[PDB]
Design an enzyme around this catalytic site. Structure first.
Site, mmCIF file in Angstrom:
data_model
loop_
_atom_site.group_PDB
_atom_site.id
_atom_site.type_symbol
_atom_site.label_atom_id
_atom_site.label_comp_id
_atom_site.label_asym_id
_atom_site.label_seq_id
_atom_site.Cartn_x
_atom_site.Cartn_y
_atom_site.Cartn_z
ATOM 1 N N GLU A 71 6.711 7.871 27.675
ATOM 2 C CA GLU A 71 5.719 7.947 26.606
ATOM 3 C C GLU A 71 4.310 8.400 26.983
ATOM 4 O O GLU A 71 3.340 7.645 26.850
ATOM 5 C CB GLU A 71 5.640 6.594 25.883
ATOM 6 N N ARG B 7 18.861 1.764 31.445
ATOM 7 C CA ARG B 7 17.675 2.548 31.736
ATOM 8 C C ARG B 7 16.594 1.554 32.142
ATOM 9 O O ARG B 7 16.203 0.705 31.347
ATOM 10 C CB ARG B 7 17.207 3.332 30.505
ATOM 11 N N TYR C 14 11.100 4.650 16.840
ATOM 12 C CA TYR C 14 11.045 3.364 16.157
ATOM 13 C C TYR C 14 10.759 3.455 14.666
ATOM 14 O O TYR C 14 11.327 2.703 13.869
ATOM 15 C CB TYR C 14 9.961 2.473 16.772
ATOM 16 N N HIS D 233 6.322 4.116 34.428
ATOM 17 C CA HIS D 233 6.266 3.525 33.103
ATOM 18 C C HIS D 233 4.925 2.791 32.929
ATOM 19 O O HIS D 233 4.893 1.572 32.754
ATOM 20 C CB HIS D 233 7.454 2.566 32.928
ATOM 21 N N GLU E 60 5.528 -7.436 25.775
ATOM 22 C CA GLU E 60 5.186 -6.317 24.895
ATOM 23 C C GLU E 60 3.705 -5.958 24.992
ATOM 24 O O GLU E 60 2.949 -6.057 24.027
ATOM 25 C CB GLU E 60 5.576 -6.646 23.447
ATOM 26 N N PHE F 291 11.757 -7.929 21.563
ATOM 27 C CA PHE F 291 12.521 -6.705 21.287
ATOM 28 C C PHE F 291 13.951 -6.737 21.821
ATOM 29 O O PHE F 291 14.717 -5.801 21.601
ATOM 30 C CB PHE F 291 11.813 -5.502 21.928
ATOM 31 N N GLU G 180 14.968 4.919 23.687
ATOM 32 C CA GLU G 180 14.429 3.669 23.145
ATOM 33 C C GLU G 180 14.590 3.681 21.630
ATOM 34 O O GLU G 180 14.381 4.707 20.983
ATOM 35 C CB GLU G 180 12.943 3.498 23.477
ATOM 36 N N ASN H 299 11.996 8.244 22.303
ATOM 37 C CA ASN H 299 11.787 6.824 22.025
ATOM 38 C C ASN H 299 11.359 6.763 20.564
ATOM 39 O O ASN H 299 10.201 7.033 20.232
ATOM 40 C CB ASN H 299 10.679 6.259 22.921
#
Lengths: 491, 491, 491, 491
Positions: free
Chosen positions: C180, C90, C323, C134, C451, C460, C396, C321
């Site tokens: 996002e 992706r 986390y 993005h 990041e 990451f 993600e 996504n």
């Protein structure tokens, strides 16, 4: 008005809800769509005779002489299936078109017709699921010995089935011996509203010289015996590669207890036993439901040991024709109640309204189809938990749009049918999620057709048939949704 | 017709279904049964004034001038309770009969009356559950400052409550500060169909010079503040033996989502928050439901820190007045919808029919009472699981027999009321079996009475009042069943 | 220290836990890995501008000028995917590299680049899942009209998406319109820590001349409108074969009620509505969550009827996504609380510790990623039970190893990342076992990258990027585990 | 700080949560509150000796010479119980005060004292629950044969118990033979921090000439044998009316598996077997838990057939002293691990933190009491489901306020203790709702007292003891709540 709430956008089924092996299709029957009733050597069936002798018994004074003229326009039926992306086509073979005299000389023209349809389906990557008999009895056999009321029908049917296996078995690998035996026995010999149109003296049907408490059971018994003989022959000589499957399709209604009471819970079980068990239990265990034998007694024929053995486990696949549900209300045994119609033997009245006075579900057009998808899921779980979870195909499911219904002014804008179908497809998903072995969903009504005693006044098709424009096929809103559902590439 | 199915014989409740401490009783309210509206020094209430000034606002042009004349015939009410074997009598005290001017000099004749009733109940082994205010505001206070729309009502109510505690607290050990605050605010200041009869300009009510989006909330806020002050005083000076209990009675409707959708599930929660939470949440946690504050904003008064503290845990017992349920249907926020009535603030329409078009339950007589006992069990479990499972009494429950209803030609043959009551008593049993702390069931309508804007046209009693025979008390079929249920010895 | 307990040996996931169709992959985004920010005709993006104008806003004073230099070294990224046996990659397309001026002339060099990457992936049997946007907005559009704060962004985005469909749609069959949107609106226009770096006057961000209570919602509204227009175009002209899918990827945090109270249960629902529902509900039903409209009002734009229709059911696939998770604590509405940041509108504070004072889970390296895989399973079941169970891909998932963390001295020995990933892969299995339609798991961080405001200080990747050795790719312990997990043949 | 979240207002227990037979009370023990250690003929106990010989072994250099001086001020203890509305007082009888020489002549002054306390309790409608032995061994027996390490203790204890039955049995109908045998064996002979203070050579305790792997088991075996002999005598000669009950009180900690693994699930069962089963299983089935015998072997004495028979079913009531819970972590058997302390024999380490690094619950003051009410409910269900659901009383439950804790500056403002107690009372309600036969809740600490090796530095009372104001009794916030909870009438 009538209030018809639709599914929310996130509740609409997607093809992905089912695995790669699941099969979506549509269904039709020979007399309902073929036409050419007396063409190329075809002999008359009991329905040709019934309509031609008692035309008044059809609501709109119509018949299946031409129907959708699928004998000539079958390629348009195949095209409709292809345009919708259907993977299966369930159709039936006309006994009188293949064997004009019921027995004897096979009509090559009849054989050639079905071969053309079968080959076209295969060329278009559509799998044929064939129903051998769909109320389609040759009038020659009706005249000779009373058709299904005589034991001779067993061997005659067997030989007809064999003709089908020998000529089409190399390509057709999925069969249904009979369609809706319960509906057939009830309407053809009980109320007599269907061909041959028999009922007890004093009742209102074409030929009131039968016995509504006996002929339905006699006919059903012969259907089961014929089924058993045909399957035995099939497994012995027409499944050498072991890749073919045979079974039967049952008309079934869901049932809910009328009131919260153990009495209506018992009534509900009797209703299911009568509507579904009558023919399903014999093919599962080799005998009729105990409830039926205890209530019908001598009027329900006994099976011999050998017959019970041939019947048990005689179906590789089970077809369920589901449309609606009813509430079951207990009826006490007492001198105040005496059965007159075979359906009275269940001692459970079928009610459209429950204890609170409310209809079981929204009416969808024709007077008998109340929408209640939950009933289907419940029946599927009974198949799973009680009868061994055999492979089940929803061989029929859908609604009718009725001529004259002001809420359905545009025959192609069938949003109600679409919502109903989406809800039942979702109900099937629910059953599968719960472990039921459901293998497919075939919408009844690939195309609008002859709805028996209601004629063409009831339109069940995903595809409209324009009777005033040469029986042209026109996709309805529902059909177009299937095109999207099945990811059919666009032009 | 309308189909009204009754419980099966083995489903009828028995007293043994509940423990020895459970309490069965009946209820009434002062204005609805007392009469003697201007007798022995009693001052006028807002309802006396409303009826006398706008008589046309009562369906049958009647009022509570005499009602069941319980001021004079209270001994017959006690006798009816005794004959049925009831253990509790929930009645209310008339503020204007005790304090003719709202504040000031107490009317000894008023005090003597209630003392006689209380002593008679005790002499007959019946426990009195007293409602201090039942929409019964002294017109003197309405004239002086607008009654419950002014902060002064808080202290004035407190002093009235104190008079009740001081004079009756030695025998009365169970109190309800207010009755149905939600109903009162909605009908008295929203639609304005109840005294004082206020609503927004342009609306159809006696005095259309209020504000249906604000006055209901102002009145409710003062009710809660008055409740808090009265309870604080009660616990501090009138519960020295620690054996008394005080709380309030809430009108509540059960709710089911209109359609299977997370949107109507959310709508249902807003409906419950508005109907029940409006007054229950403040007494539980000290503030209104978040949903209400988020939707009503500046129109819903803020509580000070001290007020929230006095309100939280202010009820020893919770009274639920349950009659029916509705489907809750989501309403979107958009410029296309603008609230005009306070009930619009819930953004959830109350529907009598669900997504399938069916009524939620059988109509029982009056247009708004649809039978749905499940709704009560659901609410009781919400009390248990969400609000801490406080002691709950069903302070009102029942149906009306309406004048003119051809299905109810004999006022004493109230089999429908009996079945309804049996079904709800069973629903309470279901809640108790599931852990809900339900302590009693009081049928609304010990006797037929003045049903507010519908006058005497709606009969809610277990006991008939023969208005043409000196208001004589006659036990109905339902009342006689209670005699058996309670094992009352026969003569 | 910090105590980090690992899974037991028999609890480690095996590829066999998922069916043959499940897809494991890794993800990256254009600005975070490409470099060549001004090469071969590429125009500047909002992030190029943000970093070059306010370099101090990046923790380690770095930027994406070179990043992992994937513009030149993409073949090494493909090799890493192949070495790990990943089936999906992706990645995102740089708007400014394809359309330097936002609109107008397409940069052929940009098109050629992505074609090379796509063809290499396909040659290596890896399926490309492409994110169109993005956070990558062309600064030309930011300068011209304020980028996503102006309605013009809708058509401009649509034309960009069309360029992508026309040039890559013949091979790329899975797309995500936006990445996002909630994170973007919150950080770019709320706190202003991300490009363009706007926030309310008085706040600490690069350009404090915005409005943290309004710009986030304006931007989000345009994102949704752009998404709707792009999808409509896609389905109409770029999915002729019906084999392509398009949707969007949502950043989501799991939530648990802070304390055992119905108030925090309500707060939790508001948190989910705000974090996930803000963008998910519009694509599901066509409008924002009711909670948001009730709390944000006029600051949250209304959708027209046509827009709601285009938005509802606009996603074929949903990307999540995930986390970490947080506890949700209720915030009362009162004059004591006044929203200043858009996130304040949820009236639910996100807490890292619960009512007992304990962290929700073990810290994994960077300050915000607390390990709580249960939160993911819970969200997946909400997708299943509340929103219709649409196809979901974990687009993600992963953790960061932070520069300076003494517990992570060897960048390749990422046993913590491996354990975290194994635990979440197992949590996905749990969701699938419970009926959730989860189709894949893409680890965020195919390679270490930029990041955002933390620069390269947070690693990451499954694959290490040696910045001092020509950005060489080196497989970490986690990457090697995937090689085994995916049964990659060894040399 | 430390974060200590309290119950929400609607979650606070009400007396009504329990039935009329449930009993709320408070507890104390002779050495911890009596004082008058050498008054009126009383002989020295092992604790008098321990404190007087090794004063340094008590944290604050204090002892029980005076304690709360309950020998003289017992009427104030009765008053405190009455003021709180407690229905039960669990206290213990001092063996050395009744039999100064362990055996022989009974001290009439001792008998007179307890008779006064018992009669005062009865006069105040408080039921006495008496513990016969509470670590209170006469030093005369310790000197003569080593107290509980010698078989002679069995008959000597039996004769002491008989003195109690003969003198107090006419009024006292509920007894506990021993208090916390597991705590006693572990601390008195394992770690040696409690009288007589023995442990293995090399360890840090007053008299390091014992054996921490053997003496704890020897002492426990004699406790069980003494219990069996005393109960046999009780049932045979001191329960002629059949209305008395006898059992023992067990110290118990709840346990949760450290990590999600079958290994820690097994470890948890070993922890429960060791902490609770050690003494409970013998009184239930007549032998120690199999886990203990398999791990301790020859160090755990065998019971004869007759002894097993006398032990099985020897308890009419079970007392559980619950304060906290721990995580149980598996320890492997290998040459790398060798038991040195008796608690090592469980091969399960007790951890205050779990696999995620978080404490099991909030610390309440003293270092070992972490709040985890769930652990109690779990233990109660084990009693119900595994051991036959015998009558269970929570004989001890509470927390300590520690001298020097800046978060507890006002000794009377014990809101933390109150919240803790309310939460555990609610946990008991949960167990009862689930079928556990829990009959009462006795808070440990009617009054602040001598907390063994921690002296008076730990205050466990509901009632404060002002040591600088003549040991005056002062009700704390918690005590006042009980007054309200128990509906005690006010002055």
């Amino acid at each position: 008005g009538p209030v018809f709430t639709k599914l929310k956008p996130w509740q609409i089924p997607k093809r992905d809800w089912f695995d790669k092996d699941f099969l979506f299709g549509a269904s039709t029957s020979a007399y309902q769509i073929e036409g050419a009733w007396n063409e190329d050597g075809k002999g008359p069936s009991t329905w040709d005779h019934f309509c031609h002798t008692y035309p008044e018994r059809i609501s709109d004074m119509t018949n299946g002489d031409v129907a959708a003229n699928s004998y000539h326009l079958y390629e348009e039926d195949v095209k409709a299936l292809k345009d919708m992306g259907m993977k299966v086509y369930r159709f039936s073979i006309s006994w009188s078109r293949i064997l004009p005299d019921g027995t004897g000389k096979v009509n090559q023209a009849g054989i050639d017709y079905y071969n053309k349809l079968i080959n076209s389906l295969i060329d278009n990557d559509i799998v044929p699921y064939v129903t051998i008999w769909h109320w389609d009895t040759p009038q020659a056999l009706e005249d000779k010995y009373g058709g299904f009321l005589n034991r001779q029908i067993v061997d005659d049917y067997k030989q007809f089935a064999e003709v089908c296996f020998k000529n089409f078995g190399d390509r057709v690998k999925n069969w249904f011996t009979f369609n809706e035996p319960h509906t057939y026995c009830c309407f053809s010999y009980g109320e007599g509203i269907h061909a041959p149109g028999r009922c007890s003296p004093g009742m209102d049907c074409a030929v009131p010289e039968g016995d509504s408490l006996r002929e339905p059971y006699t006919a059903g018994h012969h259907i089961l015996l014929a089924h058993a003989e045909a399957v035995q022959l099939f497994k012995a000589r027409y499944n050498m590669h072991g890749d073919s499957k045979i079974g039967m399709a049952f008309d079934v209604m869901g049932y809910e207890p009328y009131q919260d009471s153990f009495l209506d819970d018992q009534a509900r079980e009797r209703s299911i036993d009568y509507n579904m068990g009558w023919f399903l239990e014999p093919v599962v265990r080799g005998d009729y439901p105990f409830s039926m034998r205890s209530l019908i007694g001598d009027r329900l024929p006994m099976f011999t040991k050998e017959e019970q053995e041939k019947l048990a486990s005689s179906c590789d696949i089970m077809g369920l024709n589901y449309y609606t549900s009813r509430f079951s209300k207990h009826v006490d045994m007492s001198p105040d109640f005496t059965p007159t119609l075979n359906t009275d033997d269940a001692y459970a009245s079928s009610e459209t309204t429950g204890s609170d006075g409310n209809d079981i579900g929204p009416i969808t057009g024709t007077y008998w189809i109340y929408m209640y998808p939950k009933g289907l899921t419940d029946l599927l779980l009974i198949m799973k938990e009680k009868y061994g979870n055999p492979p089940v195909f929803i061989t029929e499911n859908g609604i009718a749009d009725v001529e004259g219904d002001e809420s359905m002014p545009d025959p192609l804008d069938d949003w109600k049918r679409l919502d109903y179908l989406q809800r039942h497809i979702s109900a099937v998903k629910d059953a599968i999620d719960q472990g039921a072995d459901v293998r497919g969903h075939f919408t009844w009504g690939l195309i609008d057709n002859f709805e028996w005693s209601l004629g063409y006044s009831s339109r069940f098709g995903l595809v409209y048939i324009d009777k005033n424009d040469g029986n042209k096929r026109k996709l309805k809103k529902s059909a177009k949704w299937f095109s999207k559902f099945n990811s059919v590439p666009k032009p």
